[PDB]
Amino acid sequence: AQDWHRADIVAALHKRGITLAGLSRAHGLAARTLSNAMERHYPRAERLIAQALDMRPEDIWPQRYRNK
Amino acid sequence: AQDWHRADIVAALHKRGITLAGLSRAHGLAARTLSNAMERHYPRAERLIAQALDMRPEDIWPQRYRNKK
User: Fold this and answer.
1) Is B21 helix (H, G, I), strand (E, B) or coil?
2) What is the three-state SS of B33-46?
3) Contact present, B37 and B46 (Cβ < 8 Å)
4) How many CA atoms lie within 13 A of A10 on its CB side?
5) Which residues of chain A neighbour B5 with C-beta distances below 8 Å?
6) Are A65 and A57 in contact (CB under 8 A)?
């Protein structure tokens, strides 16, 4: 029902040994691109994070995808 | 840097227990007046939403206000 917090997303990545620095460098992104997606909706960055967690972005961000 | 999305603005209002239906009725607005401001710039309606969130509209819509000159 409620969106994941930045702290939920980061922790879950750390569970699988991923970092935002590492996941940004890998996909060729600017630093804040993934960090900003923790607070403010950006579909293409959310698809990258969802797939890193074997998920659909709609399950991490149910509200973001309902409020559009 | 980038403007807030409709989903960012809505969510933030819901955080404080506000809805667009409620905020429209309060300020005497037509339904779509606030909804349209989520997509397309309208200064006086965005000033209303900013103040509901203890903010300046320039922080919610940095691009709209930079893309005005």
Assistant:
1) helix
2) HHHHHCCCCCHHHH
3) yes
4) 11
5) 40-41, 64, 68
6) yes
Distance from the Cα of B13 to chain A's closest Cα (Å) equals 12
| Nearest residue in chain A measured CA to CA from B38 | A68
Q: What is the resolution of this structure in A?
A: 2.5
* Residues, chain A: 68
Q: For residues B57 and A59, give the distance between their C-alpha atoms in angstroms, rounded to a whole number.
A: 30
Residue of A1, A7, A11, A15 whose CA lies nearest to A59: A1
Q: Which residue of A has its CA nearest to B14?
A: A63
Other residues' Cβ atoms within 10 Å of the Cβ of residue B57: 21
Domain tally, chain B: 1
**Contacts of residue A67 in chain B, CB cutoff 8 Å?**
6-7, 10-11
Alpha-carbon gap, residue A10 to A21, rounded angstroms? 11
Tell me which chain B residue has its CA closest to the CA of residue A62: B7
